[PDB]
Design an enzyme around this catalytic site. Sequence first.
Site, PDB file in Angstrom:
ATOM      1  N   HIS B  29     -15.144  25.268   3.984  1.00 22.85           N
ATOM      2  CA  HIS B  29     -14.728  25.122   2.541  1.00 22.85           C
ATOM      3  C   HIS B  29     -15.841  25.169   1.804  1.00 22.85           C
ATOM      4  O   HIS B  29     -16.543  24.511   1.459  1.00 22.85           O
ATOM      5  CB  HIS B  29     -14.158  23.708   2.690  1.00 22.85           C
ATOM      6  CG  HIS B  29     -12.965  23.424   3.587  1.00 22.85           C
ATOM      7  ND1 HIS B  29     -13.171  23.128   4.860  1.00 22.85           N
ATOM      8  CD2 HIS B  29     -11.530  23.369   3.298  1.00 22.85           C
ATOM      9  CE1 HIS B  29     -12.001  22.862   5.353  1.00 22.85           C
ATOM     10  NE2 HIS B  29     -11.006  23.189   4.404  1.00 22.85           N
ATOM     11  N   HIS B 266     -10.516  27.742  -1.338  1.00 25.35           N
ATOM     12  CA  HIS B 266     -10.561  26.182  -1.031  1.00 25.35           C
ATOM     13  C   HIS B 266     -11.137  26.308   0.469  1.00 25.35           C
ATOM     14  O   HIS B 266     -11.977  25.205   0.675  1.00 25.35           O
ATOM     15  CB  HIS B 266      -9.069  25.605  -1.243  1.00 25.35           C
ATOM     16  CG  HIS B 266      -8.828  24.678  -0.317  1.00 25.35           C
ATOM     17  ND1 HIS B 266      -9.125  23.233  -0.607  1.00 25.35           N
ATOM     18  CD2 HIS B 266      -8.549  24.398   1.267  1.00 25.35           C
ATOM     19  CE1 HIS B 266      -9.269  22.627   0.484  1.00 25.35           C
ATOM     20  NE2 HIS B 266      -8.508  23.268   1.642  1.00 25.35           N
ATOM     21  N   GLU B 414      -1.551  -2.262   2.645  1.00 24.30           N
ATOM     22  CA  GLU B 414      -1.991  -2.373   4.100  1.00 24.30           C
ATOM     23  C   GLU B 414      -2.931  -1.062   4.333  1.00 24.30           C
ATOM     24  O   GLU B 414      -3.981  -1.365   4.834  1.00 24.30           O
ATOM     25  CB  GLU B 414      -0.688  -2.260   5.174  1.00 24.30           C
ATOM     26  CG  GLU B 414       0.027  -3.449   5.090  1.00 24.30           C
ATOM     27  CD  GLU B 414       1.179  -3.453   4.221  1.00 24.30           C
ATOM     28  OE1 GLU B 414       1.238  -2.094   3.358  1.00 24.30           O
ATOM     29  OE2 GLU B 414       1.845  -4.653   3.874  1.00 24.30           O
ATOM     30  N   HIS B 477      11.414  -5.083  11.410  1.00 25.37           N
ATOM     31  CA  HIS B 477       9.963  -5.983  11.268  1.00 25.37           C
ATOM     32  C   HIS B 477       9.581  -6.160  12.805  1.00 25.37           C
ATOM     33  O   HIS B 477       8.485  -6.491  12.958  1.00 25.37           O
ATOM     34  CB  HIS B 477      10.220  -7.076  10.468  1.00 25.37           C
ATOM     35  CG  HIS B 477      10.440  -7.109   9.386  1.00 25.37           C
ATOM     36  ND1 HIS B 477      11.204  -6.527   8.473  1.00 25.37           N
ATOM     37  CD2 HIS B 477       9.792  -7.730   8.486  1.00 25.37           C
ATOM     38  CE1 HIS B 477      11.014  -6.698   7.161  1.00 25.37           C
ATOM     39  NE2 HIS B 477       9.648  -7.527   7.076  1.00 25.37           N
TER      40      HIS B 477
HETATM   41  C1  LIG Z   1      -4.152  13.107   4.479  1.00 19.20           C
HETATM   42  C2  LIG Z   1      -4.568  14.585   4.598  1.00 19.20           C
HETATM   43  N1  LIG Z   1      -3.317  15.342   4.482  1.00 19.20           N
HETATM   44  C3  LIG Z   1      -3.592  16.529   4.354  1.00 19.20           C
HETATM   45  C4  LIG Z   1      -4.869  17.107   4.594  1.00 19.20           C
HETATM   46  C5  LIG Z   1      -5.106  18.822   4.489  1.00 19.20           C
HETATM   47  N2  LIG Z   1      -5.777  18.786   3.163  1.00 19.20           N
HETATM   48  C6  LIG Z   1      -7.076  19.178   3.184  1.00 19.20           C
HETATM   49  S1  LIG Z   1      -7.838  19.452   1.747  1.00 19.20           S
HETATM   50  C7  LIG Z   1      -6.497  19.133   0.958  1.00 19.20           C
HETATM   51  C8  LIG Z   1      -5.984  19.255  -0.413  1.00 19.20           C
HETATM   52  C9  LIG Z   1      -6.998  20.160  -0.976  1.00 19.20           C
HETATM   53  O1  LIG Z   1      -6.987  19.925  -2.407  1.00 19.20           O
HETATM   54  P1  LIG Z   1      -8.154  19.018  -3.117  1.00 19.20           P
HETATM   55  O2  LIG Z   1      -8.063  17.625  -2.760  1.00 19.20           O
HETATM   56  O3  LIG Z   1      -7.605  19.074  -4.735  1.00 19.20           O
HETATM   57  O4  LIG Z   1      -9.285  20.043  -3.045  1.00 19.20           O
HETATM   58  P2  LIG Z   1     -10.122  21.197  -3.412  1.00 19.20           P
HETATM   59  O5  LIG Z   1      -9.353  22.444  -2.904  1.00 19.20           O
HETATM   60  O6  LIG Z   1      -9.804  21.279  -4.865  1.00 19.20           O
HETATM   61  O7  LIG Z   1     -11.329  21.177  -2.992  1.00 19.20           O
HETATM   62  C10 LIG Z   1      -5.275  19.132   2.070  1.00 19.20           C
HETATM   63  C11 LIG Z   1      -3.632  19.050   1.801  1.00 19.20           C
HETATM   64  C12 LIG Z   1      -5.763  16.310   4.769  1.00 19.20           C
HETATM   65  N3  LIG Z   1      -7.202  16.547   5.021  1.00 19.20           N
HETATM   66  N4  LIG Z   1      -5.752  14.931   4.760  1.00 19.20           N
HETATM   67  C1  LIG Z   2       5.283  -2.868   4.289  1.00 21.47           C
HETATM   68  C2  LIG Z   2       5.597  -4.185   4.159  1.00 21.47           C
HETATM   69  N1  LIG Z   2       4.401  -5.152   4.210  1.00 21.47           N
HETATM   70  C3  LIG Z   2       4.696  -6.310   4.341  1.00 21.47           C
HETATM   71  C4  LIG Z   2       5.883  -7.107   4.224  1.00 21.47           C
HETATM   72  C5  LIG Z   2       6.052  -8.265   4.213  1.00 21.47           C
HETATM   73  N2  LIG Z   2       6.617  -8.873   2.901  1.00 21.47           N
HETATM   74  C6  LIG Z   2       7.963  -9.161   2.583  1.00 21.47           C
HETATM   75  S1  LIG Z   2       8.403  -9.472   1.130  1.00 21.47           S
HETATM   76  C7  LIG Z   2       6.602  -9.333   0.814  1.00 21.47           C
HETATM   77  C8  LIG Z   2       6.300  -9.421  -0.687  1.00 21.47           C
HETATM   78  C9  LIG Z   2       7.220 -10.096  -1.760  1.00 21.47           C
HETATM   79  O1  LIG Z   2       6.774  -9.929  -2.914  1.00 21.47           O
HETATM   80  P1  LIG Z   2       7.908  -9.132  -3.985  1.00 21.47           P
HETATM   81  O2  LIG Z   2       8.049  -7.886  -3.333  1.00 21.47           O
HETATM   82  O3  LIG Z   2       7.550  -9.364  -5.112  1.00 21.47           O
HETATM   83  O4  LIG Z   2       9.320 -10.226  -3.691  1.00 21.47           O
HETATM   84  P2  LIG Z   2       9.674 -11.451  -4.511  1.00 21.47           P
HETATM   85  O5  LIG Z   2       8.746 -12.577  -3.639  1.00 21.47           O
HETATM   86  O6  LIG Z   2       9.011 -11.471  -5.872  1.00 21.47           O
HETATM   87  O7  LIG Z   2      11.211 -11.464  -4.160  1.00 21.47           O
HETATM   88  C10 LIG Z   2       6.032  -9.080   1.736  1.00 21.47           C
HETATM   89  C11 LIG Z   2       4.708  -8.973   1.732  1.00 21.47           C
HETATM   90  C12 LIG Z   2       7.150  -6.000   4.224  1.00 21.47           C
HETATM   91  N3  LIG Z   2       8.185  -6.413   4.270  1.00 21.47           N
HETATM   92  N4  LIG Z   2       6.699  -4.898   3.928  1.00 21.47           N
END
Ligand SMILES: Cc1ncc(C[n+]2csc(CCOP(=O)(O)OP(=O)(O)O)c2C)c(N)n1
Ligand SMILES: Cc1ncc(C[n+]2csc(CCOP(=O)(O)OP(=O)(O)O)c2C)c(N)n1
Lengths: 666, 666
Positions: B29, B266, B414, B477
Amino acid sequence: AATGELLEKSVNTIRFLAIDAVEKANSGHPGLPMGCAPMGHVLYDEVMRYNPKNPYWFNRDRFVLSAGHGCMLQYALLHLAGYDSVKEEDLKQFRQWGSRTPGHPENFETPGVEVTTGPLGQGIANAVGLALAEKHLAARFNKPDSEIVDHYTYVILGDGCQMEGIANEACSLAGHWGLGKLIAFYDDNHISIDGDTEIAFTEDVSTRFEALGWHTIWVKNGNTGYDDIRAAIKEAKAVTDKPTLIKVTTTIGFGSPNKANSYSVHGSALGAKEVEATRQNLGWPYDTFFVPEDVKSHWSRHTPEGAALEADWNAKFAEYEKKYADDAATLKSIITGELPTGWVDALPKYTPESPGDATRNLSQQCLNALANVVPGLIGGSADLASSNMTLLKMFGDFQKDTAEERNVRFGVREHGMGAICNGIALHSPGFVPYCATFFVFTDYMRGAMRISALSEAGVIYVMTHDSIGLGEDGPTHQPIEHLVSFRAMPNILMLRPADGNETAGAYKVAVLNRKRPSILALSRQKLPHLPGTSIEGVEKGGYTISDNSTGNKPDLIVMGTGSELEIAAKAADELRKEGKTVRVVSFVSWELFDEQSDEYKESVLPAAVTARISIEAGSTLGWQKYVGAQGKAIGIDKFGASAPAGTIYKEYGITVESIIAAAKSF
Amino acid sequence: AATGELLEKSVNTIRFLAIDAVEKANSGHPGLPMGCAPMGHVLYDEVMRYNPKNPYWFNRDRFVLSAGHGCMLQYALLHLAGYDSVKEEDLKQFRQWGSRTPGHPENFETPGVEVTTGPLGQGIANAVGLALAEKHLAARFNKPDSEIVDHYTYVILGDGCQMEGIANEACSLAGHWGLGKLIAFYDDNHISIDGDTEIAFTEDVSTRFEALGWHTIWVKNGNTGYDDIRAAIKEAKAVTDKPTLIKVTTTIGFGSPNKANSYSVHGSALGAKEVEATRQNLGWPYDTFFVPEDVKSHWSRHTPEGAALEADWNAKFAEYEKKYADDAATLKSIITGELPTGWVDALPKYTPESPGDATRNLSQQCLNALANVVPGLIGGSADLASSNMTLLKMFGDFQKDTAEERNVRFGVREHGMGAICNGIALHSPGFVPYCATFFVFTDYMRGAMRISALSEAGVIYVMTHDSIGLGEDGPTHQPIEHLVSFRAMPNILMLRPADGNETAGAYKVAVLNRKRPSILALSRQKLPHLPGTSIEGVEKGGYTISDNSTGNKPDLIVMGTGSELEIAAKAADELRKEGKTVRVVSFVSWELFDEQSDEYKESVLPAAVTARISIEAGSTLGWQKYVGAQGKAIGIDKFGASAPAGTIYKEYGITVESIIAAAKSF
Ligand SMILES: Cc1ncc(C[n+]2csc(CCOP(=O)(O)OP(=O)(O)O)c2C)c(N)n1
Ligand SMILES: Cc1ncc(C[n+]2csc(CCOP(=O)(O)OP(=O)(O)O)c2C)c(N)n1
Ligand SMILES: [Mg+2]
Ligand SMILES: [Mg+2]
């Protein structure tokens, strides 16, 4: 619309159905339903177009609860609206074995629930997909004299969904695409499980949404500001070029004197003392699961009115079909899921005289062939179109002004891309959404992929650069555990085609499987077309491609997948010249092989034959099931390397010499 | 600082080292390095404090390349700065087998590279963790007269990182936490792999960053605006209360007459004709890999100046140690990675008198005990503190104004949480970062967990609600494939403790494993303490907890993990009463068992014994490795259900009756 005391009683009916269902289960989430009852009432009772006796009506408005824990809000509303899937007794079997009222909303259990939520952020991303589907179909099929496609996508999401990366990804695309019929209600209750949102979530959500290209409204009193909610929705419909975020400030557990506005009310039953205190505070003398007669009578109108609305649309579709027969038949395929007759014949054919090519390129040939005969094929790559080989060359790009186009350009948004595709798949059963990245980055989007499998969404996952075969990008990019990580996952095919005929076979299987997602692990590098590969073979998952044995007693069975099947084939050629009888088996899908008869399995892997070798550039875990007690699995149980792919294969022992050495060792 | 022609030659030295390394590899790159050479030169040559002959110096500024594909930028700068890890010969082995210059930056290959990037978004989230680590140590240890902790975290990220969900999650937390020493450079080059960003990425990134609580600057001429870059960094460092986003507009492939400003540059070598055209356009007469003697002389000063910076800081640390002896000893522990003597003795012990408890609660006991004896233990839950049981009760929460505190509240983030903890782990070797969610939501954060494994970051993943044992929340879950999905992943422990002694054992292993992440799968539900569980057993992964056999020839071996070990133990009790000899085996870690001697393995799973049963509430895939073709794996190869956990166990056959039935069948 309900007014005064009838409106109050209707909104409290929703609150107490949630409270009473949670109390009876001694399990679930009363907080969100208590706070969201006003906006839920306005949405189902006043705003949404649907037929409660036909949850499958093509032109219904779609509702998604992204904050799926709050599912008793939706169950209460489906019940009051007259949906057959939520009778009084279903509310009484909330969170109970085999009920239609599971603890998170499941489309596969409850007709009237559009998608499966519970994993936070999935639902808002699904709603972006449902709105993409509507905008595409409207642009593609509407005529100056026939607006045959016209429906809104409504979604309720909370603070959890707003913190999840997948929601920012999908909402960036919704703003980019100008999805003006996407209307999102943010339950702004300042509470999540850890308590006040001040602990970890102080960002300006509304300004972030403006930056993402959204229209924003703030309803400051979502507990009692019915007219403000109604005016917000009307303003949202008036803004046609941008999706709308209506930030609705509620009290979680509104009406609970002792648990309102606290994490206490998020996720457990009120308990006897607080149920009575809430009944006294809200002025609810009524027995458990009670729908007042005046509320019952008010809601009953949705059955006749919903039948009349659908009948109006049916008349419009009949007139469309009369005037635009060809376009109507194409749209009917997407509506019904009936794939056009002879579609399989569009797939390409190969022989060992065909020039060698990478299964990523053979995949593009299959996608392009299918685009002409599968009207609902739509999708694309997360910023890797020219590497995953996803472009449908007869079409342009889906954009705000060209929504009729069928190439979807997701940018670097794997997780949002997967959940958007779940929304497309579950819009209409004739959609065949496909999406793509390097196979290693399935890890980014695995939450959505698992929900494809659980929700029976037939998404085609086109996953290239499937091994150390990709070479120099190195161990950050090279899958190892990925194949077995999906072989373990329920209801998903992990297809790993060797060549042109297997790639065509994998696509036939993927298109047929409208209730089970398919992953295709595809090569960066060119591979030969092998004697004996076939579509018929791929449909069986494990099948013999070569055999010089007699009596179903080969001296040796060598099994392989993808780029390693040619290594197994070459090793078999060398061993046969030494006088050995060898059977070569393609394991393009473990899942489909396992589905076969005992007799078929015995025909491929005879119990009497113990001399068995597997070769696959990935984890050896689970291969012992097929190579058995005496057999040898050749694979990779460590991370990869940054080198030309040829060097990695040699150093990692993914070679014909490794197969020959294993054959000697029996 | 370099001026005039010397500055031009230094910036071009960076461009051509990248061009020529990529050209020799015919892989990689050149685009990002060509565009980013100005900001890279200013960062390494003028701004960053480091010792190039001591990459481990505690108080160094940290640099992260989140856009890891652009790694020749960092390799060029490490080379010019005088790092022993990147000599001329290392540049000539770019993307070659086992080199110190892999195709993406890898801390485990290249001292001077802080973290492993390549998967987009990880690096910016890592930089949030590195800046959290600095802010925590500064608040915890600094005194009004001794600012002993004081260093900045610099990160370069591109359009890809800015599209990824993980980056929005981590940057929301960075703004919430007021990480004023986090300075991010956004390479605003309007290009990703699909071409111009207009295809899928039109959001206002800088306004989103303002909404996330960031200070923003725009350098509109990033190609030649050296003074503008320098002024932006000065302003960023002077803003103490908010992280800074410096949007730097560059031309990708700057100086290539034919490939600048396109996707072309790129991700592939310029090729011979365009290398010569670029040399002619930039006015670069120099041979390949050549550093002009004036550029060499200019950069050579970082060796003596970097030694002097570290020596100055060592004098500051000696004065700190003199005046604040106890605080100095604690901070030195985190710096060196020496764990205090006797820390293991803090872990709790359990006997037949101990009440049964859920391993989630036993986990909280271990965390609280370790917090008193492991100074670098820091971390927490993604909005599930009161369900995962992660609070260190003797400490408050990490926040902008209380950064000395050791409970980190991640909100519903997460993926960001995992990559933040990779940053903490790789800040200083005495950090022991832990983070938590429900086990099923490992799928959300799997990209960062895989990088923990590859980068040798000793993150403790505290993953509760590990099975159908959680009950009513239902199949969205309930983990199924998760245990085996991590068993297949290289360099990560998949620990599943049955009880108090096993949970203590899993924590001893997790703390000792500073170069391998540990996942602890922990129960929602209460479990008994089982006779024969031990820390010593957990250390061996697979070990016998009960045995009435002789001659190492049990009639039956029953193996289990976690909540299913008591089911195996109860079945063994019933079978032994009939006069059968039964061995019960805990498989708390497959990984540690597989590391043991042939003699040890034979002592637990004798080859002569074919009558083997496994029981585990998850996928059966891979258990044949230990139960064999003639054995029986009892598990779940389908999704779960929304019901009381007791009902699910019965319906899914995770029962002592299933073990007895399997035992009868041999
Ligand atoms: C999570 C993830 N998805 C996809 C890729 C594949 N990938 C490598 S670079 C890139 C995007 C490049 O765009 P940018 O971050 O804008 O870099 P630039 O071309 O400007 O150097 C992608 C999709 C990756 N490395 N990681
Ligand atoms: C991806 C994910 N991470 C964690 C959980 C556990 N979880 C259940 S509801 C919640 C958050 C509750 O907040 P909000 O979305 O504001 O609901 P409210 O309590 O206001 O009804 C979490 C952490 C989940 N269901 N999905
Ligand atoms: Mg909330
Ligand atoms: Mg870019």
